[PDB]
Amino acid sequence: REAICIHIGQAGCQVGNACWELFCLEHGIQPDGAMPSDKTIGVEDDAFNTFFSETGAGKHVPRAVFLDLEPTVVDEVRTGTYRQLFHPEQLISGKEDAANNYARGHYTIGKEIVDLCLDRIRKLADNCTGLQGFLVYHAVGGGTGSGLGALLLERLSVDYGKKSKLGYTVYPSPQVSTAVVEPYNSVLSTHSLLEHTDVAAMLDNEAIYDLTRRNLDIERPTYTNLNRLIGQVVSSLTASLRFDGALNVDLTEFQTNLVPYPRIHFVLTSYAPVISAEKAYHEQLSVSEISNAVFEPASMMTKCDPRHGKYMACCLMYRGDVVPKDVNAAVATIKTKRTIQFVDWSPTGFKCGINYQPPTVVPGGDLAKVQRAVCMIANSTAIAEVFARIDHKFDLMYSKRAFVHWYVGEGMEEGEFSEAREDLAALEKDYEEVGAESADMD
Amino acid sequence: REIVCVQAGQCGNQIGSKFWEVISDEHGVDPTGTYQGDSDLQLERINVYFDEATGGRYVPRSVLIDLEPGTMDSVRAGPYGQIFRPDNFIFGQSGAGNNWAKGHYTEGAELIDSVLDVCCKEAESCDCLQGFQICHSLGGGTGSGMGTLLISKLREQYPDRIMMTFSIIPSPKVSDTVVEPYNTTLSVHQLVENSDESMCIDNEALYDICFRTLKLTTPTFGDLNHLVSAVVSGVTCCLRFPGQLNSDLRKLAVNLVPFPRLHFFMMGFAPLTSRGSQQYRGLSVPELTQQMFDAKNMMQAADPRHGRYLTASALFRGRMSTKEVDEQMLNVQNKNSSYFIEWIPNNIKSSVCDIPPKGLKMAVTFIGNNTCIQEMFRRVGEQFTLMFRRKAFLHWYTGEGMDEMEFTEAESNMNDLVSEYQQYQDATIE
Amino acid sequence: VLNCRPTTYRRDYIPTAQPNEYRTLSHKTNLQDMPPSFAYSTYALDDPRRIIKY
Amino acid sequence: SAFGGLFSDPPLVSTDIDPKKTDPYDKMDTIPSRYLGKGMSIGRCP
């Protein structure tokens, strides 16, 4: 039933604004003073419970914390018309940023703020009766996202133990870049996330920009569009907990079905009926077309090509008016294709889910209205190419200790760079070995 | 996150006066000090540069120092001069005489305690202190000597903060004073040890900007000080307004300096264009980036084509797409690939801010870290060695008390800075 | 032309937000005329669901 | 200190740095003896 959301740093808070806007509009949470003055669904239902708790007087409050080291973005949430929602204790802001230094966030500044965050999360976790996971949004390219994200997941992993943790993460794009020190922060972050996360969702900004240019008709996209797409994906995955359906899927089923070995937990994500209003009125959108669409690389939200690898597992979530027989016909057609390949040790490669609630339309939004949608998370060996490129860029910079003096000044030993680089090299070797056929001479 | 300003010497006091006019205009503060703005976004970060006095009033967080009160009386007589706190005006009783050693050792040690007491008193009142901001010329006498003395004292007292300096440096042809090489060399020697980041401006570059780009028939020092105030106010813009990708002085320093000695940068501001001509310019991101890399808009005499960029930063003000910024910076890196140092995979940092400077629909300020600055240091070392070998004017400084070994040490340290720039310029992967 | 200047959040997510609904206001504005609203709720004390019948 | 303004940061009971002194969320507790087992087998008359 319950899930707690933790938003860290700039990308995580900006994606959080879009997420809570969407979940409010889907449930019907509105200003108390603003009477609807119009026809509404009017059905008292428990669906809010996954994200809201009641005070008994009927006010709703959301299960989220906003964490940042610079004040500007959180002070911006405290000044809008959305101040009335969050409990003021939930909006936590520090005094100064981690200045793109992972060492500064982890050792110097996040160490002061971390105990307040754990006390607030405990106060939230005490007001639950069937918590089944945390959703975390952060980018590993920046200093506070890497350092405080690692420190907070380590403390959560010791205190809460077996509970599942699903992360939505914005990784550094392979050639578009915003800061010079991105490789160092991403390697050091990835070292901590490897040990302390149950499922990791992979995102690349260059893919979501390409998807918004090719499918939608936007010449000049901005971060609000990407965050609205991320919010739609999170709403699709959490819909299985909140509404009636033919084949439900609990969040523990994702972890049991998608992860074969405890280190192989990095997954790709994609969404099908991303379509504009002008195209939407020229075409029908049946199940087989969107099932064929989710496997084309033009539909993916991460810049990797799956034709250069092998699928290990796919989890397909369908929402809206779909009938299981059409899903079975679609999956049999996908299975026939020769350019889609599964490792021979994974014969039953698919898990299906079918939910009746169609995706919501937001008044200022750019997506069209559609009766059905499908979202996919899949595990594939192609991901090894992203790490190889980050490690090559790290090796180029690290051969001359290009910026190490900042990290050494903020408290970290030079040895830690080599340890993290060797651990990510071992993850690359794991993906090389796991994908090798166990063929036997006879 | 508040900045404390220090204004030293004639150049520093005049540029500071124009800077505080520009900042007061941007936040809608009347010349009486009363807030009269029309949006909370103006008020919500006013603390960054102003302290609040009782019943509405604001006072600017600045210390004014000079050795003869003529300039101080001129700035106090100016249109916004009344805003300054009277106790913050510090002056002596005899001039610097254009001599670094007298300004640093004899009248410096006499006045320095009262300025340090005021600067410490102002800094310790803040709930969290960000770096100091100092404006001065390096070629003068009280600017160089007392500015570097104060810089050294603040570095002793606040070693964990950031230290930023803005400095004006001598043209190779337009000298205003005969003894410029000694004062410049000693000041650069002091700054390279004490400073964290130093910005440099050539009066020759501002003259060429005004004549070629703005086509001014009769420019005045108010225009040059307005260009400087524009860049200075642009660098701090992300500290005090919302945006899609926030940035900070410490974040700029960590991304711009690869090694601690390489902290001297060039500056530029893009939507500069002369009055009268029906061409508008600046109406899209390609226009700003193309003008941004045009050497007509760069504030140093050295030209980038003789060097290579180690790193660069662009801070954009205005409502714009991140794709146009990102794809323009990628296209510029790919098309001019020979001018970017190859062992760094991406040399440009971008930042976007929602609030533009008043009267412009959009603007960008550019900061560049380029090795061509080594030609300027070589030029200063040549003129210094020509004068020192012949003892051209040393008796004034020696009469104040300096040992010649300080001059030989400062020359050697500057020569080593030139060598370090040259080795990193010609480094290769192999 | 440049009298109105929004920021991106207010332009996209909360466009209809008037200047009277933000935390910072002048000290000479009336407060009794503004309707009370200090939390978010599904219903506006609506009678269809809150009343318990007997 | 970390919170700011307080004389001193209050001690925390929920969490701790030391892994052998922190308080786990999922307390692994005991079932009552009544609700287990089979109970008496009772026959009707056919």
Binding site: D75, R78, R83, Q84, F86, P88, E89, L91, I92, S93, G94, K95, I113, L116 | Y35, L43, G56, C120, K121, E124, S125, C126, D127, Q157 | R23, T24, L25, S26, H27 | A2, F3, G4, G5
Partner: peptide, 28 residues
């Protein structure tokens, strides 16, 4: 100086803003 840590006197601090803040209306 009385053999202490230099004849410098450190001025006090004025305000200390906290981490969590209220969301009630604030006036100019």
């Amino acid at each position: 100086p009385p053999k202490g840590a230099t004849g410098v006197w450190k001025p006090n601090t004025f305000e200390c803003t906290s981490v969590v803040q209220s969301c009630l209306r604030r006036f100019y």
